[PDB]
Symmetry: D2
Subunit: 132 residues, 4 copies
């Protein structure tokens, strides 16, 4: 409606990995993709602060052998019964596990639970995904 | 390492709600905020680059009456058995569903299926969380 | 403590299939296995009539294509939200599905729900399994 | 078809609670009751006969603190990846778990794993529901 240009300083290695992925997706340029990022952020954020009701999936990959991650995960999960519905676990290989934990409840409490889990030791990856 | 600098054209109201949320969270500059978003975008999409062997969860939400969405999904999924391992399904309310589909395979073929799924009359959007 | 012998009439084809399986398990004879059956029955039964609290797994295999079984299953499941926790579904092949539905609640209501489901059209197999 | 007749030695108190429950349910004779139990036993175990390719759910219940039960399970399961597909896990209370493990493979190897699982310090019993 009325465009304003500004500049940003970013480590070159990083900006290039971006350009590669973005180039792949079909984007015409950066401003375009960065705005998406920005636009999505704002939205994902108002929910996170929302403090309402969300249903979510916490996907995580972890080497069950590195530390007591397997221990911690359960203890942490059993600590939040009301918010944790059930959990799917797929043994990816001799050492690695993929586990998606379904959670329902107050976005605030859930976004803080997702954090606790993903903040764990053996946790390699992980991401929360919410719904209205 | 080399710190490259560049600028982007962005609509005001958009750039407004951003800075606006930026303060709240506690950033120092837009460059910090924006860089993160980028590091995160890379994390989320690097798999779409190349053809490495991936594995993860495809979370979606739907209405099991609103169309053939249900049969469609099964017919579709059952088409790519090899890539789709299992899938958890929570019933949110009387008509709306939450279903996490776990998969593993080659990025190109994975995104091929991810797209075909997300794009169906009945599928009301659905995020992806894939690693390698 | 004080053994009483009685006799039973049973289709020969049947008694032989029994003898085969029982022979396989490691049983020394029939009375032995039949008593197990009887002993288990009595126990599984007092729960079923129990009317208390149980957590259960309803495993079922069905050709999603034969009838609207896929339809019926969801409609029936969404009809019992409070009792149905979540559901795992594994696409066994182009036509067949294995789906284990987790349920919690009043044994009476749950044992009657398990029935409704397994009584469905496309339903080939199925069995309820309860816990204290 | 030929109706064979045979008799069995059974302890009274046992044969007592049986007939006792038989009336309730509404049977006409013990022979009806007993025959069913047998038809059902066959349904539940025919897979243990031979080596056909089976698939189903191994439902179990445990206490995630009571021993190494948890790590044990994972180490064990991760040993037979090929046969074990996925597994749903509900948290019942503060220390007790419910976990349905979905598998597919050859009867002999399936029962081999089923046994090794059911028999572990931490596993407080667990039923099997397998077909072909
Ligand atoms: Cl930074
Ligand atoms: Cl009969
Ligand atoms: Ni614990
Ligand atoms: Ni595992
Ligand atoms: Ni089909
Ligand atoms: Ni549903
Ligand atoms: Ni419906
Ligand atoms: Ni299926
Ligand atoms: Ni291990
Ligand atoms: Ni648990």
């Amino acid at each position: 409606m009325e465009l304003i240009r500004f500049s940003i300083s970013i480590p070159s290695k990083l900006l290039e990995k971006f350009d590669q992925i973005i180039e792949e997706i079909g984007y015409e340029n950066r401003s375009e993709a960065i705005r998406d990022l920005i636009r999505d952020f704002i939205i994902r954020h108002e929910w996170e602060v929302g403090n309402e009701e969300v249903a979510g999936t916490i996907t995580i990959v972890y080497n069950h052998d590195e530390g007591d991650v397997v221990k911690a995960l359960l203890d942490l999960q059993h600590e939040y019964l009301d918010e944790i519905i059930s959990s799917l676990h797929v043994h990816m290989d001799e050492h690695n596990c993929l586990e998606v934990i379904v959670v329902k409840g107050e976005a605030k409490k859930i976004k803080m639970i997702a954090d606790k889990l993903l903040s764990l030791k053996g946790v390699k990856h992980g991401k929360l995904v919410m719904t209205s």
